[PDB]
Amino acid sequence: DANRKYDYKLQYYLNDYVYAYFTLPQEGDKQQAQVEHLNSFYNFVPDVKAQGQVRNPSTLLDSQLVTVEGKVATYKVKYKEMIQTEEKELVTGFNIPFDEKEGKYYVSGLPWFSAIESSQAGYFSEDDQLQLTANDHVSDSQHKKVEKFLKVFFTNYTTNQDNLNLIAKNVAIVANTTFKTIDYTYLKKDRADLIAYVQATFEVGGTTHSENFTFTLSEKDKSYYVTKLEHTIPLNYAND
Amino acid sequence: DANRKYDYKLQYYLNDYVYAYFTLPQEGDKQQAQVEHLNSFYNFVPDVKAQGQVRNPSTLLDSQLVTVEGKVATYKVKYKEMIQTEEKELVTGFNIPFDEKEGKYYVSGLPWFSAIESSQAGYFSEDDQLQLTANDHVSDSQHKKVEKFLKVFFTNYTTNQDNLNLIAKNVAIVANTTFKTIDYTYLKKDRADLIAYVQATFEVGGTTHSENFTFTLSEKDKSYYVTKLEHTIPLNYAND
Amino acid sequence: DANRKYDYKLQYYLNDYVYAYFTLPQEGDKQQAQVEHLNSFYNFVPDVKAQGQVRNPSTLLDSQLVTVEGKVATYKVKYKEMIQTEEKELVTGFNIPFDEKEGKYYVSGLPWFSAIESSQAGYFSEDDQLQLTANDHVSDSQHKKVEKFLKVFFTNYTTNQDNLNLIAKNVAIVANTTFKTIDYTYLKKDRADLIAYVQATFEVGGTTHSENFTFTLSEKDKSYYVTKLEHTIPLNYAND
């Protein structure tokens, strides 16, 4: 535990290179001095056959170190360039060849730009879509006993830890929340347990949001005790 | 070393979801467009039984990805909500169900709010409390020789690496510091070594702070050589 | 994959301590209250023999958690101190002794300042320097066929994925780029393949930059197909 070792020197070295690369101030005192600091990252300033570049003042707005593999670090970069004057926001992937000598780091050649790749998945089957459209086969009198219990549960859940402890196992109260409404309830028996799949509305500051729950309910006296609580409803919820 | 592989795509995907979730601009062109980008994170936009939510403009101020386990990412979140107009700062825990398909990621259902949990430890025994209250059994003449040596040590420590090298093994000088005072010294023999437990005051810019040291001192000529330096004093320091 | 476990509670605990340590507001309501929050990090507020410190208002500008080892966390810190009034930017290394009790954390004693250490490597042999100075032994008629092909390649590379797919294996187009010029070409046979070591200039927004490439070219009809593309030129490129 407390004796674990972490070394983030490489990740922060690469962050410092990205900052040095995408940062160019306006005033010359500042500008050539920032270029010297950028050049300090290389083993050797890369050999460039062009006479020079067109350079505009620029500010780094954001960077994400997404991958390191095979001595290449890949970033997502957001920056702004002042063209003399208009300011333009730009994004690019940015790829840094680097290496290590005696536990120290350097950039080993000209970096390269790439198109940002999204890690967003797509192409899902409609079989994977949760819809809370099922109607359960539990009595209207059990529904009304469960609804009364759930209103007490969510009131305690948003207010009072000791009140919540009496009716639930190892559930923490939430902060800065008001319980508004129960919007869906599907009930299913599992031997002596009653399973409740529930959606409810909460207000935090001035904003409302909905959340899902799976309650495992045991009968206690004339009410219930929550032996288990989850914060998702599974696709198979209405498979009884 | 330099060929290590790092993949942070999941951590930054989740950061981008938190930003998309807690960011809502004022102007409609911007607002519905930010909602579309938020919706792009889901496999399917979650089924919500309420007609709609009350939504206010909001800005993300800070987020910490504290845990990922069992396909749930947990954040500490700081944001501000503009209620039309007053601005209110809010904090919450925020829990994201997600999954992975073919090396890509998605949010799999309604996230849930939780109370922020502190990782601060408490309930310590007074046995664990360091107090620099002990009086050593070393002569006043050794104390004065050690005090003179320690003033040279701390002067060099704050000034001159080559001067420091003559009187200490593998100690680096500190930058931007002035040595002010030695505030505590406990001396103890360990065979031929003299151990010095020391607190001293330093000034950095306009501010003073105290630090602790454990010196291991060897006799060199009519003075000392520091064979070892630590930056803590142990609870057992006055167990001779 | 999606079931991986991450725990960053220690790293963010230490970030919160650094923020608490280097943050001191102006107004007393705020100031003594920030000191109480700072003191909450310790198992016990450290025993300090000085009567007190000189404290000035201060803001944390940046911090990097570079190492954790042997119950010491080491940071690079940037802050600013208001001396009453002038503002001064300062940098320091900052070292935190900490420990863990029952999965929770605490700071165990007085932290210590250190000089920032750069992870920049130096002292390279000129043998390791890439210079694009070699002249190849390939015919001027092959050079002109390759130059025409490379202008098509870089046009597609900056424009049209489907056009690029016809002439290259698994190469992604770049975004927001205009191809300007080929500035260096070294050609070498490798059995039936032709290797091209190339530098080219690109414009992104208002700014130009150079990049290096190693193409592996197969003959296709009266032109070429790129079977492999790298974004570096190796030191041995002109060893035929």
Residue numbers in the entry:
A (entry chain A), B (entry chain A), C (entry chain A): 86 to 169, 174 to 329
What do the study authors state?
We determined the crystallographic structure of OrfGExt at a resolution of 1.83 Å. As anticipated, it exhibits two NTF2-like domains D1 and D2, connected by a long-extended linker. In domain D1, the region between residues 92 and 204 forms two successive α helices followed by a long loop (instead of a third α helix typically observed in VirB8 and VirB8-like proteins) and then a highly curved antiparallel β sheet composed of four strands wrapped around the first α helix. The domain D2 (residues 228 to 321) adopts a similar fold to domain D1 [root mean square deviation (RMSD) = 2.57 Å for 78 aligned residues] but with a shorter α helix 2 and shorter loops between the strands and once again lacks a third α helix before entering the β sheet. A notable feature common to these two domains is the high proportion of aromatic residues in their core, predominantly phenylalanines and tyrosines (D1: four Phe + four Tyr; D2: seven Phe + two Tyr), at the interface between the helix 1 and the β sheet. In the crystal, OrfGExt forms a complex consisting of three intertwined protomers related by a threefold axis. The six NTF2-like domains are arranged in an almost flat triangle, with three domains D1 in the center and three domains D2 at the vertices. The notable feature of this arrangement is that each domain D1 not only faces the others (distance from center to center: 30 Å) but interacts with the domain D2 of the neighboring monomer (at 24 Å) instead of its own one positioned far away (52 Å), thanks to the long linker that stretches to wrap around the domain D1 of that neighbor. The D1 domains show minimal interaction (273 Å2 in OrfG, 444 Å2 in TcpC) and do not significantly contribute to the trimer stability, while the D1:D2′ interface represents a sufficient contribution to maintain the assembly (910 Å2 in OrfG, 965 Å2 in TcpC). In the crystal structure of OrfG, the trimers display no discernible interactions between them that could suggest a higher-order assembly.
The main model of our study is OrfG, the sole VirB8-like protein of the conjugative and integrative element ICESt3 found in the Gram-positive bacterium Streptococcus thermophilus. Bioinformatic analysis using constrained consensus TOPology prediction (CCTOP) predicted that OrfG consists of a single transmembrane α helix (residues 37 to 57) followed by a large soluble domain (OrfG64–331). This soluble region comprises two NTF2-like domains OrfG64–204 and OrfG223–331 (referred to hereafter as D1 and D2, respectively). Our data confirm that VirB8-like proteins are predominantly extracellular components, assembling into a conserved pattern, which serves as a building block of the DNA translocation channel.
